[PDB]
Amino acid sequence: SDISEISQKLPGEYFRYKGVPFPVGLYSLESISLAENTQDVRDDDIFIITYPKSGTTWMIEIICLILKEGDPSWIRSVPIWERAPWCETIVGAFSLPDQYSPRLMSSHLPIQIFTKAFFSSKAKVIYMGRNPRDVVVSLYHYSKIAGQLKDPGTPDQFLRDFLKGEVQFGSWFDHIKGWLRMKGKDNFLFITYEELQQDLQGSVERICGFLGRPLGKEALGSVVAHSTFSAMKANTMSNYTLLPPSLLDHRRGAFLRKGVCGDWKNHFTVAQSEAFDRAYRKQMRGMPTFPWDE
Numbered sequence: 001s002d003i004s005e006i007s008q009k010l011p012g013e014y015f016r017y018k019g020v021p022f023p024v025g026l027y028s029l030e031s032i033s034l035a036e037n038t039q040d041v042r043d044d045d046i047f048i049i050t051y052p053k054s055g056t057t058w059m060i061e062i063i064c065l066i067l068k069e070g071d072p073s074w075i076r077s078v079p080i081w082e083r084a085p086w087c088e089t090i091v092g093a094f095s096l097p098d099q100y101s102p103r104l105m106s107s108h109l110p111i112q113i114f115t116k117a118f119f120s121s122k123a124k125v126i127y128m129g130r131n132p133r134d135v136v137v138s139l140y141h142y143s144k145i146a147g148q149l150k151d152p153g154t155p156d157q158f159l160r161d162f163l164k165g166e167v168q169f170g171s172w173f174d175h176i177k178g179w180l181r182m183k184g185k186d187n188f189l190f191i192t193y194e195e196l197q198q199d200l201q202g203s204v205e206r207i208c209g210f211l212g213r214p215l216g217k218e219a220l221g222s223v224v225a226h227s228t229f230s231a232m233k234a235n236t237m238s239n240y241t242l243l244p245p246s247l248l249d250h251r252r253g254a255f256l257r258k259g260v261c262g263d264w265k266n267h268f269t270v271a272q273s274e275a276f277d278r279a280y281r282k283q284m285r286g287m288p289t290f291p292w293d294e
C-alpha cells in the first residue's frame with residue numbers, strides 16, 4: 001500500500017541531476033545523491049550496471065542463482081527487486097538494513113554519477129551492454145506500459161530523442177563509453193546481451209570465474225536452466241507481474257517482451273537505420289569492435 005500509492009501518483013515525467021534525465025517519482029535528488037556520495041561500499045559487494053533495457057533482469061537472475069549455487073529457492077520466493085536492490089531509487093539498497101551477506105545491487109547510473117567511493121574500493125562491477133538498436137526498441141515498448149516513463153510518441157520521434165540522449169539516464173553512447181574506461185581493472189567485467197544469447201553456459205562460467213564462485217556441472221546447468229527467457233518469463237517473482245498496474249500495465253504488455261537479438265530490424269525503417277548508423281559512427285569513432293557491429 002506504500003508502493004501502490006506511489007505508483008498511482010507517477011507523472012510520467014523527468015527531472016535532471018547534474019544534467020542527466022531521471023524519471024520523477026521513483027527517483028529524487030536525495031536518492032541519487034545518496035548513492036553517489038555514500039561511503040558504504042564493501043570489498044565483497046557486487047554491482048550490476050547497465051544502460052536501461054540491456055538485459056539487467058537477466059544478469060540479476062543469473063547471479064542470484066550463482067550465489068545460491070543453482071538452488072532456485074531464493075528466486076522463486078523473493079521478488080527480483082528485493083534480491084538485487086537499486087542504488088539510485090527512492091528506496092535504494094543504501095537506505096535498507098543489511099539483509100544479505102554478500103550484497104548484490106543494481107544501477108543504471110552513468111560513471112560520472114555512480115558511487116564515487118567505488119573507485120578506491122575492491123567491490124566488483126559487472127557492466128553489461130546490448131546492441132543499442134535493440135535497446136531502443138525494447139525501451140520504446142516498455143515506455144508505453146511503464147508508469148514512471150512518459151509516452152514514447154512516434155517510433156521516429158522517440159528515435160531522435162534516444163540519439164540526443166533525451167531519455168532516462170541520458171545518452172547510451174556516453175553511458176557505455178564512460179564505463180568502458182574501467183576496462184582493465186580486475187574488479188570490473190564487461191559482458192554483452194549478445195554473448196549470453198550466443199553461449200549462456202559459457203557466459204555463466206565467465207561470471208563465476210570473475211566472482212570467484214566455481215560451480216559443479218549440476219549447479220551450473222541449473223543456473224542456465226532457470227536463467228533462460230522462457231523460465232524467467234514464467235517466474236512470478238522475476239517477471240514483474242506483481243507490481244501495481246499503474247507502475248507496470250500488465251494488461252497492455254510484459255517486462256520480458258521478446259528476449260531475442262535483432263528485433264530492431266522489424267522496427268527500424270531503412271531511413272531510420274541509416275540515420276542511426278551516421279550517429280553511431282560519429283559517436284563511436286575510436287571505440288573497439290562490439291558483437292553487434294556488423
Ligand SMILES: Nc1ncnc2c1ncn2[C@@H]1O[C@H](COP(=O)(O)O)[C@@H](OP(=O)(O)O)[C@H]1O
Pocket residue numbers: 050051052053054055056057058134137138139227228229230232255256257258259260263
Ligand atoms: N533471460 C532472458 N533472456 C533473454 N532476454 C531477456 C532475459 N531477461 C530479460 N531479457 C530482456 O532484457 C530486456 C529488459 O532489459 P532490462 O532488464 O535491462 O530492463 C527485455 O528485452 P526485449 O524488450 O527486447 O524483450 C527482456 O525481454
Ligand SMILES: CC(=O)[C@H]1CC[C@H]2[C@@H]3CC=C4C[C@@H](O)CC[C@]4(C)[C@H]3CC[C@]12C
Pocket residue numbers: 003026052053056081086089090091148243
Ligand atoms: C521503491 C519500490 O517500491 C521498488 C519496488 C519495485 C521497483 C522497480 C522494479 C523494476 C525497475 C526496472 C529498472 O530497470 C529501473 C527501476 C525499477 C522501475 C524499480 C524501481 C524501484 C521499485 C518501484
Ligand code: NA
Pocket residue numbers: 012142143144145146147148149150151
Ligand atoms: Na509510460
